[PDB]
Amino acid sequence: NYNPKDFDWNLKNGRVFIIKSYSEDDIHRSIKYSIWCSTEHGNKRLDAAYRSLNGKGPLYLLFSVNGSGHFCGVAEMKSVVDYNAKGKFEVKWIFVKDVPNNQLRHIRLENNDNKPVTNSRDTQEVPLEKAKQVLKIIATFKHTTSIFDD
Amino acid sequence: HPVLEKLKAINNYNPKDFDWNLKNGRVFIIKSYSEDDIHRSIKYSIWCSTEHGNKRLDAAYRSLNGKGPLYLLFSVNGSGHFCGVAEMKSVVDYNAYAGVWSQDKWKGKFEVKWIFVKDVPNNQLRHIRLENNDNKPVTNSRDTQEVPLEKAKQVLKIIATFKHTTSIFDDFAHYEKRQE
RNA sequence: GACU
């Protein structure tokens, strides 16, 4: 299933990034087929990050549709980028749940002009200690809506 | 990326030969809460600090004249590493607005030449603790905090040698479009 | 609101 209760994020030596999706379609498509597509530049940031980690740590992605006013899940990146068509990479969705920004607005990114983690753009990175705070709020939160509702 | 390949050519980044000069030079931590600003500074070879930091960097530079290099050790707040070393190359123009940084508030400008561009994790330098702070580790520094000669040698050495695995260039294309 |  999704939304595990016992989830050890294993963040110690990972990195964590914000994904800003252009459409709820892409979220529906990503979940069904365990891939994601970013812009040319953001894919490429993600490729170097992932490859840099070389499996010493996870690379998590926090999804929010543009204008949705909530976060809509977390997935781990599972492959280098594939440029055989567009660039694609595999993702394993771990949490599908609607987390409203009101619950996360108070966390500011001291790497991005102290803007709230909810005021990020695509592939904005979340510092390790703010990511622990974010992911824990996402993990334990009791959602009433979900992208599945659509 | 063609832009980065101009930069890379004119600038021998991460040189393996660095005679750090020093032994008459003076060294400061630079902190940024915008990595966009670190990408902007590498491109445009300029930096700007707070009004207080501008005055501190200006004063050290001017008391050196050219008898000693002023090196700047950059690191983004919350990033868990330093991201590169640059030399201060001019006095401070306190008037300029530049309009390059990710925030308008930054008044002023001075030239830098970026030398090393590499991510050095904090735990490679946590042991060097600055007596001129309150014996906090150099990783716990604020912006324009001076590093004494003898501890800057230790810090500069580890940055020169460290086999880095990431760099801000890994994100060149990402930060470049964030200028639009 | 250019500390960790």
mmCIF file of C-alpha atoms (C1' of nucleotides) in Angstrom:
data_model
loop_
_atom_site.group_PDB
_atom_site.id
_atom_site.type_symbol
_atom_site.label_atom_id
_atom_site.label_comp_id
_atom_site.label_asym_id
_atom_site.label_seq_id
_atom_site.Cartn_x
_atom_site.Cartn_y
_atom_site.Cartn_z
ATOM 1 C CA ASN A 1 0.000 0.000 0.000
ATOM 2 C CA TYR A 2 1.078 3.626 0.651
ATOM 3 C CA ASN A 3 1.580 5.965 3.577
ATOM 4 C CA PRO A 4 3.537 3.556 5.828
ATOM 5 C CA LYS A 5 3.402 4.105 9.563
ATOM 6 C CA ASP A 6 6.807 2.595 10.290
ATOM 7 C CA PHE A 7 8.964 4.611 7.904
ATOM 8 C CA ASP A 8 12.660 5.140 8.642
ATOM 9 C CA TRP A 9 13.548 7.949 6.250
ATOM 10 C CA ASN A 10 17.264 7.067 6.539
ATOM 11 C CA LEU A 11 18.015 10.697 5.827
ATOM 12 C CA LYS A 12 21.532 10.754 7.403
ATOM 13 C CA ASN A 13 23.375 10.833 4.083
ATOM 14 C CA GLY A 14 20.513 11.571 1.649
ATOM 15 C CA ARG A 15 19.195 14.695 -0.071
ATOM 16 C CA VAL A 16 15.612 15.933 -0.379
ATOM 17 C CA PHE A 17 14.096 18.144 -3.092
ATOM 18 C CA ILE A 18 10.792 19.849 -3.899
ATOM 19 C CA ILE A 19 9.007 18.870 -7.134
ATOM 20 C CA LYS A 20 6.539 21.444 -8.483
ATOM 21 C CA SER A 21 4.183 19.684 -10.914
ATOM 22 C CA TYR A 22 2.366 21.582 -13.626
ATOM 23 C CA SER A 23 -0.758 19.430 -13.537
ATOM 24 C CA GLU A 24 -2.606 16.880 -11.470
ATOM 25 C CA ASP A 25 -2.403 14.752 -14.621
ATOM 26 C CA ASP A 26 1.352 14.302 -14.240
ATOM 27 C CA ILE A 27 0.852 13.155 -10.656
ATOM 28 C CA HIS A 28 -1.730 10.597 -11.794
ATOM 29 C CA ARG A 29 0.659 9.450 -14.528
ATOM 30 C CA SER A 30 3.704 9.317 -12.289
ATOM 31 C CA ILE A 31 1.972 7.147 -9.673
ATOM 32 C CA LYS A 32 0.551 4.685 -12.187
ATOM 33 C CA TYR A 33 3.881 4.094 -13.961
ATOM 34 C CA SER A 34 6.608 5.009 -11.397
ATOM 35 C CA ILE A 35 8.375 7.631 -13.490
ATOM 36 C CA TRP A 36 8.789 11.372 -13.361
ATOM 37 C CA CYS A 37 9.721 14.046 -15.917
ATOM 38 C CA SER A 38 11.064 17.460 -14.920
ATOM 39 C CA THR A 39 12.330 20.296 -17.080
ATOM 40 C CA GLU A 40 15.552 19.706 -19.017
ATOM 41 C CA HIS A 41 17.568 21.577 -16.365
ATOM 42 C CA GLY A 42 15.833 20.156 -13.312
ATOM 43 C CA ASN A 43 16.201 16.542 -14.581
ATOM 44 C CA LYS A 44 19.815 17.295 -14.863
ATOM 45 C CA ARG A 45 20.267 18.688 -11.402
ATOM 46 C CA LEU A 46 18.473 15.526 -10.275
ATOM 47 C CA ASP A 47 20.755 13.290 -12.364
ATOM 48 C CA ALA A 48 23.940 14.731 -10.875
ATOM 49 C CA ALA A 49 22.505 14.638 -7.341
ATOM 50 C CA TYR A 50 21.342 11.027 -7.663
ATOM 51 C CA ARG A 51 24.592 9.890 -9.294
ATOM 52 C CA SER A 52 26.588 11.849 -6.709
ATOM 53 C CA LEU A 53 24.836 9.998 -3.882
ATOM 54 C CA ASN A 54 25.895 6.682 -5.528
ATOM 55 C CA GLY A 55 23.489 4.844 -3.252
ATOM 56 C CA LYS A 56 25.099 6.029 -0.019
ATOM 57 C CA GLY A 57 21.751 7.751 0.713
ATOM 58 C CA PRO A 58 18.191 8.301 -0.473
ATOM 59 C CA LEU A 59 17.031 11.071 -2.762
ATOM 60 C CA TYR A 60 13.474 12.035 -1.757
ATOM 61 C CA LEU A 61 11.074 14.229 -3.749
ATOM 62 C CA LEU A 62 8.213 16.234 -2.227
ATOM 63 C CA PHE A 63 5.419 16.825 -4.690
ATOM 64 C CA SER A 64 3.081 19.791 -4.960
ATOM 65 C CA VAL A 65 0.961 20.677 -7.968
ATOM 66 C CA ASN A 66 1.297 24.298 -8.994
ATOM 67 C CA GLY A 67 -1.387 26.243 -7.214
ATOM 68 C CA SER A 68 -2.752 23.253 -5.335
ATOM 69 C CA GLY A 69 -2.198 24.826 -1.906
ATOM 70 C CA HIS A 70 -1.074 21.477 -0.447
ATOM 71 C CA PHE A 71 1.661 18.887 -0.853
ATOM 72 C CA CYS A 72 0.494 15.648 -2.416
ATOM 73 C CA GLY A 73 3.071 12.966 -1.629
ATOM 74 C CA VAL A 74 6.672 11.788 -1.374
ATOM 75 C CA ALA A 75 8.596 9.481 -3.712
ATOM 76 C CA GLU A 76 12.151 8.224 -3.801
ATOM 77 C CA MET A 77 14.205 8.556 -6.954
ATOM 78 C CA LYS A 78 15.160 5.116 -8.270
ATOM 79 C CA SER A 79 17.059 5.595 -11.556
ATOM 80 C CA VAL A 80 19.393 7.870 -13.438
ATOM 81 C CA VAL A 81 17.687 9.999 -16.089
ATOM 82 C CA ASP A 82 16.802 8.326 -19.369
ATOM 83 C CA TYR A 83 16.984 10.415 -22.533
ATOM 84 C CA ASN A 84 15.841 7.761 -25.046
ATOM 85 C CA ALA A 85 12.724 9.758 -26.157
ATOM 86 C CA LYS A 86 12.159 14.254 -22.902
ATOM 87 C CA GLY A 87 13.982 12.759 -19.936
ATOM 88 C CA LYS A 88 12.508 10.240 -17.523
ATOM 89 C CA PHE A 89 13.589 8.573 -14.323
ATOM 90 C CA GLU A 90 12.029 5.999 -12.038
ATOM 91 C CA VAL A 91 10.344 6.959 -8.771
ATOM 92 C CA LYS A 92 8.933 4.799 -5.965
ATOM 93 C CA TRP A 93 5.940 6.521 -4.404
ATOM 94 C CA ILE A 94 6.072 6.122 -0.631
ATOM 95 C CA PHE A 95 3.436 8.580 0.592
ATOM 96 C CA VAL A 96 0.319 9.605 -1.288
ATOM 97 C CA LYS A 97 -1.616 12.048 0.932
ATOM 98 C CA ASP A 98 -2.759 15.674 0.820
ATOM 99 C CA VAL A 99 -0.794 17.811 3.303
ATOM 100 C CA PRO A 100 -1.960 21.458 3.322
ATOM 101 C CA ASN A 101 0.652 24.194 3.342
ATOM 102 C CA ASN A 102 -0.734 25.648 6.629
ATOM 103 C CA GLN A 103 0.982 22.693 8.302
ATOM 104 C CA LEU A 104 4.369 23.372 6.713
ATOM 105 C CA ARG A 105 4.450 27.145 6.080
ATOM 106 C CA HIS A 106 6.376 27.677 9.332
ATOM 107 C CA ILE A 107 9.481 25.883 7.977
ATOM 108 C CA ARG A 108 11.701 28.360 6.097
ATOM 109 C CA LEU A 109 14.563 27.428 3.759
ATOM 110 C CA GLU A 110 17.718 29.189 4.956
ATOM 111 C CA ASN A 111 19.205 28.266 1.565
ATOM 112 C CA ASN A 112 16.522 30.135 -0.384
ATOM 113 C CA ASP A 113 16.144 33.642 1.084
ATOM 114 C CA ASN A 114 14.383 32.138 4.132
ATOM 115 C CA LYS A 115 11.264 31.453 2.072
ATOM 116 C CA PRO A 116 8.697 29.001 3.452
ATOM 117 C CA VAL A 117 9.172 25.470 2.120
ATOM 118 C CA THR A 118 5.713 26.029 0.638
ATOM 119 C CA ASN A 119 6.990 28.922 -1.497
ATOM 120 C CA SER A 120 9.516 26.852 -3.462
ATOM 121 C CA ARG A 121 10.015 26.369 -7.156
ATOM 122 C CA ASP A 122 10.906 23.221 -9.030
ATOM 123 C CA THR A 123 13.780 21.066 -7.637
ATOM 124 C CA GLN A 124 14.386 23.477 -4.774
ATOM 125 C CA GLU A 125 16.494 21.605 -2.249
ATOM 126 C CA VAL A 126 15.549 21.320 1.418
ATOM 127 C CA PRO A 127 18.413 21.429 3.950
ATOM 128 C CA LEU A 128 18.863 18.188 5.882
ATOM 129 C CA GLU A 129 17.514 19.491 9.190
ATOM 130 C CA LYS A 130 14.508 21.256 7.681
ATOM 131 C CA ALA A 131 13.808 18.098 5.663
ATOM 132 C CA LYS A 132 13.537 15.990 8.814
ATOM 133 C CA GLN A 133 10.983 18.480 10.166
ATOM 134 C CA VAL A 134 9.057 18.451 6.864
ATOM 135 C CA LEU A 135 9.000 14.704 6.261
ATOM 136 C CA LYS A 136 7.903 14.002 9.852
ATOM 137 C CA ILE A 137 5.006 16.443 9.511
ATOM 138 C CA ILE A 138 4.155 14.699 6.265
ATOM 139 C CA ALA A 139 4.466 11.178 7.680
ATOM 140 C CA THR A 140 2.339 11.567 10.814
ATOM 141 C CA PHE A 141 -0.312 13.907 9.397
ATOM 142 C CA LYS A 142 -3.855 12.491 9.211
ATOM 143 C CA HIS A 143 -5.091 13.403 5.712
ATOM 144 C CA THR A 144 -8.751 13.609 4.633
ATOM 145 C CA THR A 145 -8.131 14.046 0.872
ATOM 146 C CA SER A 146 -5.717 12.483 -1.618
ATOM 147 C CA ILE A 147 -4.846 12.642 -5.311
ATOM 148 C CA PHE A 148 -6.666 9.280 -5.514
ATOM 149 C CA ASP A 149 -9.945 11.139 -4.878
ATOM 150 C CA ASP A 150 -9.780 12.453 -8.453
ATOM 151 C CA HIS B 1 26.429 24.054 -21.155
ATOM 152 C CA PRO B 2 28.170 26.665 -23.345
ATOM 153 C CA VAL B 3 28.082 29.383 -20.662
ATOM 154 C CA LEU B 4 29.796 27.175 -18.083
ATOM 155 C CA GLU B 5 32.361 26.190 -20.692
ATOM 156 C CA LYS B 6 33.410 29.796 -21.218
ATOM 157 C CA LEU B 7 33.741 30.240 -17.437
ATOM 158 C CA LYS B 8 35.630 26.977 -16.995
ATOM 159 C CA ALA B 9 38.137 28.066 -19.673
ATOM 160 C CA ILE B 10 39.117 31.566 -18.429
ATOM 161 C CA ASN B 11 39.271 30.283 -14.841
ATOM 162 C CA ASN B 12 41.454 27.364 -13.851
ATOM 163 C CA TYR B 13 38.870 26.207 -11.320
ATOM 164 C CA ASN B 14 39.933 23.727 -8.621
ATOM 165 C CA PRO B 15 43.660 24.103 -9.414
ATOM 166 C CA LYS B 16 45.803 21.300 -8.060
ATOM 167 C CA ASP B 17 48.829 23.567 -7.651
ATOM 168 C CA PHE B 18 47.465 26.207 -5.379
ATOM 169 C CA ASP B 19 50.335 27.828 -3.606
ATOM 170 C CA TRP B 20 47.907 29.466 -1.205
ATOM 171 C CA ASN B 21 50.286 32.486 -1.028
ATOM 172 C CA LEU B 22 49.157 33.682 2.476
ATOM 173 C CA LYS B 23 51.940 34.140 5.025
ATOM 174 C CA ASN B 24 50.856 37.846 4.624
ATOM 175 C CA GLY B 25 47.216 37.446 3.681
ATOM 176 C CA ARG B 26 43.975 37.396 5.378
ATOM 177 C CA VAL B 27 40.936 35.112 5.310
ATOM 178 C CA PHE B 28 37.155 35.462 5.830
ATOM 179 C CA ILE B 29 34.064 33.214 5.909
ATOM 180 C CA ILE B 30 31.329 34.223 3.457
ATOM 181 C CA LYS B 31 27.790 33.026 4.228
ATOM 182 C CA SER B 32 24.830 33.155 1.863
ATOM 183 C CA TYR B 33 21.177 32.257 2.342
ATOM 184 C CA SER B 34 20.659 32.084 -1.452
ATOM 185 C CA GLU B 35 22.482 29.533 -3.581
ATOM 186 C CA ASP B 36 21.292 31.521 -6.531
ATOM 187 C CA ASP B 37 23.645 34.215 -5.234
ATOM 188 C CA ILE B 38 26.550 31.768 -5.296
ATOM 189 C CA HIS B 39 25.803 30.945 -8.926
ATOM 190 C CA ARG B 40 25.517 34.658 -9.732
ATOM 191 C CA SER B 41 28.829 35.429 -8.030
ATOM 192 C CA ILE B 42 30.751 32.774 -9.967
ATOM 193 C CA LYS B 43 29.347 34.018 -13.272
ATOM 194 C CA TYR B 44 29.709 37.762 -12.756
ATOM 195 C CA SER B 45 32.829 37.522 -10.532
ATOM 196 C CA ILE B 46 31.394 39.950 -7.970
ATOM 197 C CA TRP B 47 30.181 39.749 -4.392
ATOM 198 C CA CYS B 48 28.263 41.959 -1.958
ATOM 199 C CA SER B 49 27.692 41.450 1.780
ATOM 200 C CA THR B 50 25.664 43.259 4.482
ATOM 201 C CA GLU B 51 26.552 46.925 5.044
ATOM 202 C CA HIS B 52 28.554 45.821 8.051
ATOM 203 C CA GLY B 53 30.200 42.964 6.150
ATOM 204 C CA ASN B 54 30.958 45.234 3.197
ATOM 205 C CA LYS B 55 32.817 47.569 5.619
ATOM 206 C CA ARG B 56 34.685 44.745 7.278
ATOM 207 C CA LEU B 57 35.771 43.217 3.979
ATOM 208 C CA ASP B 58 36.715 46.665 2.622
ATOM 209 C CA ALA B 59 38.839 47.478 5.691
ATOM 210 C CA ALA B 60 40.823 44.239 5.698
ATOM 211 C CA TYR B 61 41.396 44.520 1.954
ATOM 212 C CA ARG B 62 42.684 48.085 2.239
ATOM 213 C CA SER B 63 45.049 47.333 5.110
ATOM 214 C CA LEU B 64 46.563 44.633 2.933
ATOM 215 C CA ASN B 65 46.987 46.806 -0.184
ATOM 216 C CA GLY B 66 48.486 44.085 -2.296
ATOM 217 C CA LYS B 67 50.893 42.690 0.257
ATOM 218 C CA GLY B 68 48.604 39.717 0.834
ATOM 219 C CA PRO B 69 45.587 38.004 -0.683
ATOM 220 C CA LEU B 70 42.136 38.170 0.844
ATOM 221 C CA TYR B 71 40.502 34.763 0.451
ATOM 222 C CA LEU B 72 36.758 34.200 0.936
ATOM 223 C CA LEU B 73 35.363 30.806 2.018
ATOM 224 C CA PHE B 74 31.789 30.537 0.767
ATOM 225 C CA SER B 75 29.037 28.392 2.306
ATOM 226 C CA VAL B 76 25.225 28.458 1.997
ATOM 227 C CA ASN B 77 23.291 28.450 5.281
ATOM 228 C CA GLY B 78 21.865 25.018 6.034
ATOM 229 C CA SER B 79 23.779 23.390 3.157
ATOM 230 C CA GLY B 80 26.095 21.314 5.365
ATOM 231 C CA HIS B 81 29.148 22.128 3.275
ATOM 232 C CA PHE B 82 31.296 24.936 2.009
ATOM 233 C CA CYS B 83 30.978 25.412 -1.703
ATOM 234 C CA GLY B 84 34.132 27.223 -2.801
ATOM 235 C CA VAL B 85 36.952 29.712 -2.298
ATOM 236 C CA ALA B 86 37.408 33.120 -3.946
ATOM 237 C CA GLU B 87 39.929 35.956 -3.660
ATOM 238 C CA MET B 88 38.801 39.532 -3.099
ATOM 239 C CA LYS B 89 39.998 41.582 -6.059
ATOM 240 C CA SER B 90 38.811 45.165 -5.561
ATOM 241 C CA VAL B 91 37.645 47.669 -2.980
ATOM 242 C CA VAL B 92 33.928 47.986 -2.214
ATOM 243 C CA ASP B 93 31.707 50.191 -4.344
ATOM 244 C CA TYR B 94 29.064 50.996 -1.740
ATOM 245 C CA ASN B 95 26.814 52.775 -4.265
ATOM 246 C CA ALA B 96 26.134 50.079 -6.891
ATOM 247 C CA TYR B 97 22.914 48.080 -6.780
ATOM 248 C CA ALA B 98 24.008 45.376 -9.277
ATOM 249 C CA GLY B 99 20.483 43.938 -9.525
ATOM 250 C CA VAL B 100 21.882 40.408 -9.902
ATOM 251 C CA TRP B 101 21.200 38.888 -6.512
ATOM 252 C CA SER B 102 18.045 36.960 -5.723
ATOM 253 C CA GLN B 103 16.950 39.815 -3.411
ATOM 254 C CA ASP B 104 16.939 43.579 -4.087
ATOM 255 C CA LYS B 105 18.141 44.456 -0.611
ATOM 256 C CA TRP B 106 21.860 43.937 -1.400
ATOM 257 C CA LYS B 107 23.484 47.346 -1.878
ATOM 258 C CA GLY B 108 27.082 47.469 -3.046
ATOM 259 C CA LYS B 109 29.519 45.392 -4.950
ATOM 260 C CA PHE B 110 33.128 44.280 -5.267
ATOM 261 C CA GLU B 111 35.096 42.072 -7.600
ATOM 262 C CA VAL B 112 36.031 38.486 -6.774
ATOM 263 C CA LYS B 113 38.001 35.868 -8.694
ATOM 264 C CA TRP B 114 36.681 32.399 -7.997
ATOM 265 C CA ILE B 115 39.404 29.817 -7.501
ATOM 266 C CA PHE B 116 37.951 26.612 -6.083
ATOM 267 C CA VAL B 117 34.355 25.622 -6.855
ATOM 268 C CA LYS B 118 33.665 22.412 -4.943
ATOM 269 C CA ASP B 119 31.415 21.237 -2.125
ATOM 270 C CA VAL B 120 33.372 20.430 1.062
ATOM 271 C CA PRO B 121 31.155 18.856 3.768
ATOM 272 C CA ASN B 122 31.174 20.454 7.208
ATOM 273 C CA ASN B 123 32.510 17.357 8.927
ATOM 274 C CA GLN B 124 35.834 17.798 7.091
ATOM 275 C CA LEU B 125 36.430 21.050 8.990
ATOM 276 C CA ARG B 126 34.351 20.755 12.216
ATOM 277 C CA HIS B 127 37.554 20.099 14.185
ATOM 278 C CA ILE B 128 39.197 23.476 13.403
ATOM 279 C CA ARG B 129 37.557 25.651 16.082
ATOM 280 C CA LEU B 130 37.934 29.422 15.915
ATOM 281 C CA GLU B 131 39.303 30.929 19.119
ATOM 282 C CA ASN B 132 38.302 34.424 17.892
ATOM 283 C CA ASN B 133 34.633 33.318 17.888
ATOM 284 C CA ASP B 134 33.849 31.459 21.107
ATOM 285 C CA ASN B 135 35.861 28.354 20.192
ATOM 286 C CA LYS B 136 32.953 27.391 17.913
ATOM 287 C CA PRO B 137 34.036 25.287 14.912
ATOM 288 C CA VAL B 138 34.808 27.203 11.723
ATOM 289 C CA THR B 139 31.718 25.423 10.316
ATOM 290 C CA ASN B 140 29.613 27.404 12.856
ATOM 291 C CA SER B 141 30.693 30.805 11.554
ATOM 292 C CA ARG B 142 28.727 33.868 10.673
ATOM 293 C CA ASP B 143 29.174 36.061 7.619
ATOM 294 C CA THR B 144 32.536 37.940 7.300
ATOM 295 C CA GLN B 145 33.920 36.177 10.383
ATOM 296 C CA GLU B 146 37.710 36.315 10.107
ATOM 297 C CA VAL B 147 39.752 33.105 10.277
ATOM 298 C CA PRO B 148 43.193 33.581 11.889
ATOM 299 C CA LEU B 149 46.263 32.842 9.712
ATOM 300 C CA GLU B 150 47.230 29.580 11.386
ATOM 301 C CA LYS B 151 43.777 28.062 11.348
ATOM 302 C CA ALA B 152 43.078 29.270 7.800
ATOM 303 C CA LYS B 153 46.127 27.286 6.641
ATOM 304 C CA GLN B 154 44.535 24.137 8.068
ATOM 305 C CA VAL B 155 41.161 25.014 6.534
ATOM 306 C CA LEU B 156 42.526 26.022 3.137
ATOM 307 C CA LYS B 157 44.618 22.857 2.983
ATOM 308 C CA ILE B 158 41.685 20.499 3.423
ATOM 309 C CA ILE B 159 39.597 22.368 0.848
ATOM 310 C CA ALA B 160 42.373 22.171 -1.715
ATOM 311 C CA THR B 161 42.900 18.418 -1.330
ATOM 312 C CA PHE B 162 39.383 17.115 -0.679
ATOM 313 C CA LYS B 163 38.100 14.751 -3.411
ATOM 314 C CA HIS B 164 34.752 16.478 -3.814
ATOM 315 C CA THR B 165 31.824 14.629 -5.343
ATOM 316 C CA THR B 166 29.390 17.547 -5.909
ATOM 317 C CA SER B 167 29.737 21.185 -6.955
ATOM 318 C CA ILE B 168 27.379 24.052 -7.656
ATOM 319 C CA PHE B 169 28.169 23.513 -11.341
ATOM 320 C CA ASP B 170 26.087 20.328 -11.043
ATOM 321 C CA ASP B 171 23.202 22.785 -10.844
ATOM 322 C CA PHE B 172 24.471 25.311 -13.398
ATOM 323 C CA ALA B 173 21.523 24.931 -15.784
ATOM 324 C CA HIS B 174 19.016 25.021 -12.918
ATOM 325 C CA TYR B 175 20.314 28.253 -11.363
ATOM 326 C CA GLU B 176 20.820 29.858 -14.800
ATOM 327 C CA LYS B 177 17.117 29.600 -15.676
ATOM 328 C CA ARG B 178 16.254 30.901 -12.227
ATOM 329 C CA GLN B 179 17.579 34.250 -13.514
ATOM 330 C CA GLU B 180 14.543 34.527 -15.787
ATOM 331 C "C1'" G C 1 17.147 37.423 8.170
ATOM 332 C "C1'" A C 2 23.631 36.343 4.426
ATOM 333 C "C1'" C C 3 25.886 30.644 12.210
ATOM 334 C "C1'" U C 4 25.754 25.488 13.416
#
